[PDB]
């Protein structure tokens, strides 16, 4: 859901960065 | 997607790493 799309782009930003 | 959600789940198993 919702939440987890969330929380799957801040796991995309944390590697990213 | 399906794609998207594997690659999810490898994100949460490269950080719980
Ligand atoms: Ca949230
Ligand atoms: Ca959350
Ligand atoms: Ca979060
Ligand atoms: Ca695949
Ligand atoms: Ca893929
Ligand atoms: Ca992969
Ligand atoms: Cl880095
Ligand atoms: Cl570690």
Redesign the interface.
């Given at each position: 859901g919702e939440e987890?799309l969330q929380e799957?782009q801040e796991?995309?930003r944390?590697?990213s960065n």
């Open positions: 987890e799957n796991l995309i944390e590697k």
